[PDB]
């Protein structure tokens, strides 16, 4: 089963961050998306009550202008400033995008489910410049749903320019909606570390409710902070309130050239870091990561992680979502499709493209590109791939995976009937090369890749 280095990189990247299934990552038990979600919702509390699942909620929120007391005992109340208000509304929107929640602002003396306010001092009346924020779970008790932030932190005052402030808003709102931190730890109680993490996926990579940096799981965000819910948070909040199936149901583009009107899904130039888990409820969608020069690894599989713009594990696709297309940058990239019909564009650089199942359309772009086939099921005659920009003598088609059942023999213009043979057939009228592969144990020739252009036997890796 000696397969090529290009196939191996697809195989390995497909298994990037495998989780659950009795695995042990970082010496800890590995949780599936769902085991992580159940852990995060372990309080079993939402605005609809206890152990109430899949039920929507219509909630109110309020920027407090004054208080009689803060439920924690902290003092020195300061109301939200204009920037905090704007960023908090963007955080609320990132939650209502993914779950069946509506948020309506109230003012004056009206009560609200979720409230926002800052503090500056402790119960003793001394300045507190050390703490960050906290929030209270839904309930009927005094202060339920309230969230509180330390105004002496610049990131809290300036959440639109200091990424941790925006993440903190999203985080705190999550707690105010009923989500819990993955591990039984909390600010003020001793000194927890990633060694105190229940499961391996207890990190910023999987949930912004984690206390542990994305580096603990081998992700690397280079000092940036994701502003919106991450993959496990999306599953968790959907478990409580139901998924929002009205969101971005058109053809949506994430990354460069984005049409999402969401800052966390948008890169306006190559210096912008992207950190997101995408929720998308319909249509034909594209990951456009074309503006980066880093070597990237882009995986369109539901639940999978990508290494985008020189970061690691910074992009993921939520459970329940199908993203169809991907565009690499000028780096040497790996693009891995899913079972849907995908359009993959490597861009410049020497890229490895793997369409997987479905009828995919592949553009290697400038550079020495490799189009990888791991199975006869990747390109059946009934749903064949197109490779639309193949460069004879430059690009490669990798069929080394077929060695597992016997290395393919290249034949010139006829099959022998013995199987494990591959042929290139030139349609001169249309300038199309049909790559036919006859697999052993198939009575008909069932694998076809159509190529817009010429190809040579020496371009085919067997």
């Amino acid at each position: 089963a000696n397969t090529s280095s290009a196939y191996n990189s697809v195989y390995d990247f497909l298994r990037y961050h495998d989780r659950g299934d009795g695995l042990t990552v970082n010496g800890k038990t590995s949780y599936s998306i769902d085991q992580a979600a159940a852990q995060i919702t372990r309080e079993n509390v939402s605005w609809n009550g206890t152990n109430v699942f899949g039920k929507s909620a219509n909630l109110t929120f309020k920027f407090l202008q004054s208080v009689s007391s803060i439920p924690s005992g902290d003092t020195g109340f300061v109301k939200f400033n204009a920037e905090q208000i704007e960023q908090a509304k963007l955080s609320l929107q990132s939650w209502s995008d993914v779950a069946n929640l509506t948020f309506t602002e109230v003012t004056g003396n009206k009560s609200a489910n979720i409230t926002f306010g800052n503090y500056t001092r402790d119960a003793s009346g001394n300045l507190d410049y050390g703490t960050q924020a906290y929030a209270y779970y839904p309930g009927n008790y005094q202060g339920a749903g309230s969230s509180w932030y330390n105004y002496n932190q610049s990131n809290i005052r300036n959440p639109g320019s200091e990424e941790y402030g925006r993440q903190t808003f999203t985080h705190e709102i999550g707690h105010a909606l009923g989500l819990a931190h993955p591990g039984e730890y909390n600010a003020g109680e001793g000194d927890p570390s990633y060694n105190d993490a229940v499961y391996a996926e207890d990190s910023y990579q999987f949930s912004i409710h984690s206390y542990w940096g994305e580096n603990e799981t081998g992700a690397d965000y280079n000092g940036h902070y994701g502003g919106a819910p991450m993959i496990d948070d999306i599953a968790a909040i959907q478990r409580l309130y139901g998924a929002n199936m009205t969101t971005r149901t058109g053809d949506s583009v994430y990354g460069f050239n984005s049409n999402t009107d969401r800052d966390f899904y948008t890169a306006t130039d190559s210096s912008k870091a992207l950190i997101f888990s995408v929720w998308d409820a319909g249509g034909t969608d594209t990951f456009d990561f074309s503006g980066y020069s880093n070597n990237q690894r882009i995986n369109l599989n539901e639940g999978s992680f990508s290494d985008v713009g020189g970061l690691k594990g910074n992009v993921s696709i939520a459970h329940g979502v199908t993203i169809e297309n991907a565009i690499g940058g000028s780096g040497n990239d790996i693009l891995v499709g899913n079972s849907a019909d995908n359009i993959l564009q490597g861009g410049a650089g020497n890229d490895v493209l793997y369409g997987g199942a479905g009828a995919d359309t592949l553009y290697g772009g400038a550079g020495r590109d490799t189009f990888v086939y791991g199975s006869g099921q990747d390109s059946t005659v009934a749903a064949y791939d197109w490779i639309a920009d193949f460069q004879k003598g430059i690009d490669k088609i990798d069929l080394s995976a077929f060695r597992n059942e016997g290395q393919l023999s290249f034949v010139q213009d006829q099959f022998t009937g013995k199987g494990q043979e591959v042929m290139l057939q030139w349609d001169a009228a249309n300038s199309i090369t049909n790559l036919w592969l006859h697999e052993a144990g198939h009575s008909s020739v069932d694998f076809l890749v159509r190529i817009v252009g010429q190809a040579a036997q020496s371009d085919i890796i067997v």
Partner: peptide
């Protein structure tokens, strides 16, 4: 219950 409070998460800090």
């Amino acid at each position: 219950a409070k998460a800090a």
